[PDB]
Design an enzyme around this catalytic site. Structure first.
Site, PDB file in Angstrom:
ATOM      1  N   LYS A  68       0.845  -1.185   0.000  1.00 59.60           N
ATOM      2  CA  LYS A  68       0.000   0.000   0.000  1.00 59.60           C
ATOM      3  C   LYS A  68       0.893   1.253   0.000  1.00 59.60           C
ATOM      4  O   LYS A  68       1.418   1.649   1.038  1.00 59.60           O
ATOM      5  CB  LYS A  68      -0.852  -0.010   1.277  1.00 59.60           C
ATOM      6  CG  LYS A  68      -2.256   0.560   1.132  1.00 59.60           C
ATOM      7  CD  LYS A  68      -2.275   2.062   0.990  1.00 59.60           C
ATOM      8  CE  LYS A  68      -1.753   2.755   2.248  1.00 59.60           C
ATOM      9  NZ  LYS A  68      -1.514   4.227   1.982  1.00 59.60           N
ATOM     10  N   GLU A 117      10.913   1.848  10.406  1.00 64.35           N
ATOM     11  CA  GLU A 117      11.816   2.989  10.258  1.00 64.35           C
ATOM     12  C   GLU A 117      10.938   4.226  10.464  1.00 64.35           C
ATOM     13  O   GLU A 117      10.016   4.476   9.696  1.00 64.35           O
ATOM     14  CB  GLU A 117      12.492   2.989   8.872  1.00 64.35           C
ATOM     15  CG  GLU A 117      12.868   1.572   8.365  1.00 64.35           C
ATOM     16  CD  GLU A 117      13.439   1.505   6.920  1.00 64.35           C
ATOM     17  OE1 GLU A 117      13.179   2.426   6.091  1.00 64.35           O
ATOM     18  OE2 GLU A 117      14.145   0.502   6.616  1.00 64.35           O
ATOM     19  N   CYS A 132      13.501  11.548   6.210  1.00 63.14           N
ATOM     20  CA  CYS A 132      13.667  11.171   7.611  1.00 63.14           C
ATOM     21  C   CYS A 132      15.100  11.429   8.088  1.00 63.14           C
ATOM     22  O   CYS A 132      15.335  11.728   9.256  1.00 63.14           O
ATOM     23  CB  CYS A 132      13.312   9.693   7.810  1.00 63.14           C
ATOM     24  SG  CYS A 132      14.347   8.538   6.863  1.00 63.14           S
ATOM     25  N   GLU A 182      10.051  16.840  15.145  1.00 61.13           N
ATOM     26  CA  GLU A 182      10.311  16.664  13.724  1.00 61.13           C
ATOM     27  C   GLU A 182       9.344  17.512  12.911  1.00 61.13           C
ATOM     28  O   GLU A 182       8.119  17.372  13.027  1.00 61.13           O
ATOM     29  CB  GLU A 182      10.172  15.191  13.318  1.00 61.13           C
ATOM     30  CG  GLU A 182      10.479  14.914  11.838  1.00 61.13           C
ATOM     31  CD  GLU A 182      10.234  13.452  11.439  1.00 61.13           C
ATOM     32  OE1 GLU A 182       9.120  12.936  11.715  1.00 61.13           O
ATOM     33  OE2 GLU A 182      11.161  12.827  10.856  1.00 61.13           O
TER      34      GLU A 182
HETATM   35  O1  LIG Z   1      18.199   4.576   1.783  1.00 61.51           O
HETATM   36  C1  LIG Z   1      17.419   3.710   2.261  1.00 61.51           C
HETATM   37  O2  LIG Z   1      17.566   2.476   2.046  1.00 61.51           O
HETATM   38  C2  LIG Z   1      16.285   4.159   3.100  1.00 61.51           C
HETATM   39  O3  LIG Z   1      15.513   3.332   3.571  1.00 61.51           O
HETATM   40  C3  LIG Z   1      16.120   5.622   3.332  1.00 61.51           C
HETATM   41  C4  LIG Z   1      15.067   6.073   4.280  1.00 61.51           C
HETATM   42  C5  LIG Z   1      14.764   7.532   4.244  1.00 61.51           C
HETATM   43  C6  LIG Z   1      13.458   7.983   4.794  1.00 61.51           C
HETATM   44  O4  LIG Z   1      13.128   9.309   4.584  1.00 61.51           O
END
Ligand SMILES: O=C(O)C(=O)/C=C/C=C/O
Ligand SMILES: O=C(O)C(=O)/C=C/C=C/O
Ligand SMILES: O=C(O)C(=O)/C=C/C=C/O
Ligand SMILES: O=C(O)C(=O)/C=C/C=C/O
Ligand code: NA
Ligand code: NA
Ligand code: NA
Ligand code: NA
Lengths: 483, 483, 483, 483
Positions: free
Chosen positions: B175, B251, B285, B387
């Site tokens: 999704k 994450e 992030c 954030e």
């Molecule tokens: O670079 C990556 O593998 C990844 O998962 C980056 C995450 C960034 C989130 O904003």
């Protein structure tokens, strides 16, 4: 006669206490001081602070030596630990001496050794400017590990979580089962006497709901929660730690199967299923409560098992030739007995047992039941689908390999399974198709502490053991150097 | 103009649709059919069934070869994927050409290769009878992986989850963000054209609560949920899968810091922090929203960074020399501007930015904001602790190395950190003391796909990347042979 | 037809030349130019300089891509390669199409992938001053790898050494067997057309003593010598590189056993032993030349094998249903026949074969022999102890498991063993007791390229395959940073 | 006093003995019984037989426990080992107490632990019939390990080979340097008292050519030869075992550089180079005999090093404040002095030392030389290129980073290098370019026993330490089960 909490280097009492009852005879062993929310906080805060103290400065070699001193301390008091486990649970003295206590000593020694030899990774990479970069990983303590443990194998399971936590340099707040608080309290004395720094290891006594157990899971100061116990309790804990997004490691229920193929060593299989069903009076997450036997040998299997089961000596932990002690408690006996009744109502044939033994002495005030075998139930019956956690098994015939595989897998649980066959291809072909964490072939509960250990589906979350424990109890952090 | 769901090998519409709006000018790009509870169930069941079909029979080498074909098909439609990601998000074309799409191709290739090379473990042990035992582990698909992905790097993060899920032999129901559904829908076409069997990959469109996202997390048929996005959303999903004890991989947010030491290459650190604060208009992030600069170079750093930030070209995705596009949506802009106001209220000095640029053309109907630098806030200020997820950073001076490490670590988040120093000891000494998943020294967001990737505390749960992905998306099973 | 050396990017001739002879009919296939010492030096110097060229600057990703292009180039000329292997050796076309050429392609692909995924190690340590240190390892090319290959599996064994050498960033000087130089020459064409930089791969033709092979081993410019072939030759080469203390990796002779237990699938065991004794006309180092069968099934086994060996088709490589071509050469046939006589002298019963077939056509000018089976020799007979390297096997009964283990291990060789049994315990219990590099159960020469491959005792020195090749072909260097 | 051999569990004498001489004063310490060829054979045969006995039957846990007892035995006689090492070599008591003996103990403990934790590999594969196959590896003893050790770090290097050999289940025949036989003899006593089974560990005394050393290398009963010493002796040994294709593992000479960049901590670099040049009176394979210093700090470096060198106390092992004892023997002193003269002849400036100190006491009868520093030689001078193995270093200035890297690499050796710099990029950038086995940055001879240890080029063959030892001392065997 009284068991204290161990918080920030001190043994401490509490405002309330609860009874610790010998299940051999219903007698009071001791009163146990229940940690309240304030004391839980005090434990967690002390563990957080211990991380910045002398414990945090130990080299891995020195930490490992100290952990080996904990193991030494247990060995030095070996028989006291045996008596403590036995009193709380009614388990046979021989089992405590051969399984429970030596495994707890081995838990410490194995993770101390792993901590010493473990290393991390180096990744080299090219970059646009042609200078490259280096990525390397380091192993840091996760922080404060909250530990909640069950009563089936009290010290074993307690130290199964506590040892890797300490080996990875974490600090610990640990809450043993209200039904088996004694060996954990002895361990706290070993820690103190070994000179483990104040706050590194904290022991809190109490229950789950609205007690020390719950207060631990709700505390924002912990970094992770490791738990062994009931599946539904695991769901509760996962919800409780969700707002802090804490790491969790679960070993939950099972409804485990044993499968005996026509080509099995039949006497070995009967013997094997006997121990897998009735060890610790059937009170192990790993026990087989469903058994599938090929049709051509079904009657002879059931007959042989009946005979061996009836030869099992049910009595005092120290009684000569004893095989089974009581269940952990009266409340648990009430649950198991309500399943004995439910089996009859469901149409089961009671091959053996199905009640409680009569002693005509103090043991009648205890929580004994008999080893029980049922046949005649459908795969959908509640007694063949739900975890009883008593010394019971249902035996069912099967015909085809794929049929029985589908029947083993037709479950919301998937902890472990035992298979009996002398055939090379069948052993490897069938094992890989069983949807569980652990498969044993021609044995049961045979343990190499390096292997991954855990269950799939409702039976668990994550894996522990060997490098899987080193991973869970550690923060692996990545450092990238642009050159 | 229309984006369909992809369920069991077929593109299907829905009863409801929703608007996909271009943030550059506020115009309608497409209508997106929203999956209802019934369609989500159909996708999950189809995924369950595909596990028992041809996909389940492919060798590891054949599965890897097919995943390489998916990668090839994206590559063959490279510019279409670029235009899709750009239309949805306003990201500069050059970023889509260099970061977003190639990483999506590389995600598939990397995990395909990893699947070909990965093996498991063999443990030998002694037994009482002297015959010994073998424990070996095998790698099985976990089952159906539920994927929920965000809008900041849509295809990159989508494939970051989907690639290892498929490489490990799982089937998928995914999704993507309602804000960025186009490239994912394109991926479904590539999947179809490449001959991926029906049910292996399913794409469902919609929102979170009361929509496709929620239905997915609540479905009993999934074996795991992997998710990147807001921290509070992580908590909600953890609660939602707790009853099924599902594996989770998170994450989450971050409030990432950059630290510039006195011995940094100052011009490179200025350029570095510019890139870490304003890439994708601060909507990653990993972006730095807190910046600590040694007192001796603070004024020069701030002046240098102001000049560079005001040089940034904010405009159309394919405009000459463009550095920044708009935010993802008007709703997100309302959030960001809300923090811009809060910062003035909390006593910030606005070094630059602080509002929205005025274009006097159609871009005024889009969702642009200015790159923004603050000074003067306390470490306790909300704008320094929460954030924002926009193109902003606060810059604060520091005097002392230990002081600055404490200020960096004083946060409920811990995703990433960037440190600037030319000193060998300092780089390694300081890095290991930062409580985050990833540290960069003298760079930012430099990626080696084999490294562990994730965050500590509120920033994550578990790790992915390399063998960490191979473990999460696999069921690791132990088989014990008594010899 | 002519076969030139390939040196520093150029095909070159030599002062001397020798004949390539088709073993099917004894006709000339081509002229082969023999490299002198001057040209060997030139190859080695070119390979040294190539390490400092563009080859040395490629990223691991780019070098891997290039190696994948070499594999692509062989695939694009698949049937030319099949034609060349067949012409030199007389091997059945079906063996070339399914084993020989595909393995050569898979060799390159496997090690390119391995190079892409492989990483090294990070060790943290404490120090007196409390600041700690980091040890990390990096992988570098070893330097110039000398490669010398045999005639039994020409392109397979040639690329088995050349592929990991290149994958680890080395440069190569390679000398194929004089009896089979064609496929290697074609490989040089593929390298050249794939744009492999000059000097990276160099091909030299010739013999051993006083020729290219010896010259290569004596050259101080090489960093390692990898070799497959006769055991005594291994000793000679080991002496030759000793002054430079060069790394060496050897796969040498064998006198391999097959064991058939009473519980074996007899028909499958018969077919398996047929395959392991007569594949490539018994000219594989892995072939079984000693066979042990349990007494209870011995006669029945020997009868069955005789019938199957008599149905074997000996003839043209593309002949319908052909099982065996000729031996590599007339000189080799002279050796094999001399052993045929010796066996009769030692008092063997000739169950089948024992001579040469009469074709009444051009094949009578070839180097064919009949598949041969012996019984009745003692374990000390020369024909039971010395490697013959033709299509022959001796069969002997046994009574006891421990007895047969002792008889298999009673040998100065230790390359491989195949055992046949349906019993689970037996397979694992017996396999681990066999003192060889490779045991097969219920199969033979089944290869997973990730496994260690090699022999013990006189059968080898070191292991190759998977991580063991990655280790042998790399310089693993340790870097220690005091923090 | 007398030093006996230890063969098949018995201390035994020989036909001939030789003198063990104290290098401090030239006095006789003991007579050492030289093993003849017959006694060497007896030792090998006994080692072979021990493999088939109780040693061969210990579990990995039990074997490790016993190896820990060996370490315990050394620890219990700690000061006796110190005295033995000191008596033989003249090394300072404080060095033996902190480096030599504790490392011997740690060698045993580290490999015991690695043996307990180490596991092997499982590979799954697909097959044509769709049933699949399993490949797994197991770790076996290689057989009998021949160990030949040098006199520079006697017990440390002796146990560096013996510990992993025993830990992997091998049996050992070990020959210590004629110059330092005492501590190895004490170790045999420790083995005996610990109950190590007869024939598992065998100690033979003697020389190289025409003595115990030669006889051991040429014996067909050994499976492997591990050796530390001179390069040319490595060549000799490689030739001797060639006819048997024995596995070999060499740590050979070096001519090691230290490099001090302008940005180094100058004081720490002066102290560091003092330690790296004069530790054990310059008699370590890892010592720096070539030093390159950036010209901006060359004069200050050399002046500071001169001052610190002249502060070095040369004298009695138990002398108060002693830094250096004598060289190993008068014969070795004659070699080192011949180099001292040669240096003068090729035009060196003697910054300090250059002769022998005058003690006016019994030490004048010993084998002392002065710590010596040269400047003014070119890179082609013999004293700059050939290993001296005395307390000496030449110091040369350099201008460029690439220049000094080429000059360090311009050597037939490549064991180790030390580099002094505070710059982050330079440390990593330069380190990876030095063609040696071991680089230290801002330190020297800092050891993590897990890292690979050895040299490239003439400095070695293979790697030891960590898994590299575990690999070399083990036979890794592959077993393939067709399902
Ligand atoms: O670079 C990556 O593998 C990844 O998962 C980056 C995450 C960034 C989130 O904003
Ligand atoms: O043996 C173990 O390490 C373990 O955790 C056993 C779990 C049993 C719970 O009832
Ligand atoms: O299969 C391989 O990789 C290999 O090396 C075969 C050796 C056969 C020698 O005759
Ligand atoms: O420290 C070690 O393990 C080692 O092998 C040192 C070698 C030094 C020889 O002079
Ligand atoms: Na109790
Ligand atoms: Na949009
Ligand atoms: Na030929
Ligand atoms: Na001496």
């Amino acid at each position: 006669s009284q068991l204290l909490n161990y918080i920030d280097g001190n043994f401490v009492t509490s405002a309330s206490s609860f009874a610790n009852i010998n299940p051999v005879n219903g007698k009071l062993i001791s009163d146990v001081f229940e940690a309240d929310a304030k004391q839980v906080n005090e434990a967690v805060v002390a563990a957080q602070n211990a991380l910045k103290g002398p414990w945090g400065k130990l080299s891995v070699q020195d930490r490992a030596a100290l952990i080996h001193k904990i193991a030494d301390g247990i060995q030095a008091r070996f028989e006291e630990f045996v008596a403590a486990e036995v009193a709380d649970t009614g388990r046979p003295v021989h089992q405590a001496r051969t399984l429970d206590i030596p495994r707890a000593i081995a838990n410490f020694r194995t993770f101390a050794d792993l901590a010493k030899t473990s290393h991390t990774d180096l990744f080299e990479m090219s970059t646009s400017d042609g200078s490259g970069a280096l990525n390397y990983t380091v192993r840091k303590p996760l922080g404060v590990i909250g530990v909640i443990s069950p009563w089936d194998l009290p010290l074993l399971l307690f130290t199964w979580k506590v040892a890797p936590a300490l080996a990875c340099g974490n600090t610990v707040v640990a809450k043993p089962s209200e039904e088996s608080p004694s060996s954990a309290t002895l361990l706290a004395e070993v820690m103190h006497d070994a000179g483990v720094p104040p706050g590194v290891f904290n022991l809190i006594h109490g229950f789950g709901k609205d007690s020390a157990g719950e207060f631990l899971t709700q505390h924002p100061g912990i970094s992770a929660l490791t738990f062994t116990g009931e599946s539904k309790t695991g769901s509760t804990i996962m919800k409780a730690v969700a707002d802090g997004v804490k790491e969790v490691s679960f070993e939950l229920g099972g409804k485990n199967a044993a499968v005996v193929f026509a080509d099995a060593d039949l006497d070995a299989a009967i013997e094997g299923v006997l121990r897998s069903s009735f060890t610790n009076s059937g009170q192990v997450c790993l026990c087989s409560e469903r058994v599938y036997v090929h049709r051509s040998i079904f009657d002879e299997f059931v007959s042989g098992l009946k005979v061996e089961a009836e030869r099992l000596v049910v009595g005092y932990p120290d009684q000569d030739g004893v095989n089974m002690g009581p269940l952990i408690s009266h409340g648990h006996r009430d649950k198991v007995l309500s399943y004995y009744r439910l089996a009859v109502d469901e149409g089961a044939t009671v091959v053996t047992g199905g009640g409680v033994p009569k002693f005509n002495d103090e043991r009648d005030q205890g929580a004994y039941v008999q080893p029980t075998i049922w046949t005649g139930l459908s795969d959908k019956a509640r007694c063949v689908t739900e975890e009883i956690f008593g010394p019971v098994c249902h035996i069912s015939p099967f015909d085809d390999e794929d049929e029985v595989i589908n029947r083993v897998n037709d479950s919301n649980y998937g902890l472990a399974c035992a298979i009996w066959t002398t055939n090379l291809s069948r052993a490897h072909r069938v094992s890989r198709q069983i949807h569980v964490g652990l498969v044993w072939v021609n044995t049961w509960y045979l343990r190499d502490l390096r292997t991954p250990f855990g269950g799939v589906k409702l039976s668990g979350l994550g894996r522990e053991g060997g490098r899987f424990s080193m991973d869970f109890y550690s923060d692996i952090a990545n450092i990238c150097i642009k050159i």
